[PDB]
Amino acid sequence: AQYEDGKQYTTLEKPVAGAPQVLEFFSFFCPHCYQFEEVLHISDNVKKKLPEGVKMTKYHVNFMGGDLGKDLTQAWAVAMALGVEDKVTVPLFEGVQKTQTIRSASDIRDVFINAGIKGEEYDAAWNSFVVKSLVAQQEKAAADVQLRGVPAMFVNGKYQLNPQGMDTSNMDVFVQQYADTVKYLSEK
Incomplete structure (x- = not known):
């Protein structure tokens, strides 16, 4: 077939019930994640190809960057609570990976x-129990799929994107292959 298990995607042997339709995991410490945001605009290109009626979810993870890693998961909860994701994503990425001016919770603030x-x-927000539970939600979602690597995208709690199985000579072509795979998985 054109799309094959083990090629553009892998199937979770233990599917996750009630999971968000399109679920992305990232870390501000994650170099491919930086690319996915600033150079590839993966989330954006996926959204432009998703059907009417699907919501997209994006969560931060703890397992990179130790103490600051967790602070960032809490800050991302703050960003989701306040609805300011599109305002802090780029400066957080650049503060962590480019200028390296983010070294503490104060710097994130x-x-x-x-x-x-x-x-x-x-x-x-930072100290709110609404943000606590949003942190809890991020950890649980990641825990449910035994997540050890980012960037990661899961569709309907059953399929995991496999970008290693897509061509990378052309950045544009990679992005469309990725997005088209999400759409296909979505319709499955």
């Missing part, structure tokens, strides 16, 4: 302040 989220509002 600075990114949000510079993005126009008020201090009061950030700190209130």
Whole structure:
């Protein structure tokens, strides 16, 4: 077949019930994740090809970057709670991987302040039990699929994208292959 298990995707032997339709995991410490965001715009290109009626979910993971890794998972919970993902994603990536100016929870906070989220509002969210449970949700989703690597994308709790199985001579062609695979898996 054109799309084959073990080629563009793998199938989870232990499927995950109730999982989000399109679920992406990333880390601000993750170099392919940086590429996926700034150079490839994977999430965006996937969304443009998904059917009417599907929501996309993106969660941060703990297993990279130790203490700062966890802080970032909490900050991403804050970003989801306040709905400011599209404002902090790039400066967090660049602060961690490019300028390396993010070294503490305070430095993460600075990114949000510079993005126009008020201090009061950030700190209130940071310490909120709504953010606690959003952190809990990120960890649980990752735990359910035994996640040891990012970037990762899962479709309907049953299929995992396999970007290693797609051509990388052309960045554009890779992105469309990725997105088309998501669509196909989606319709499966």
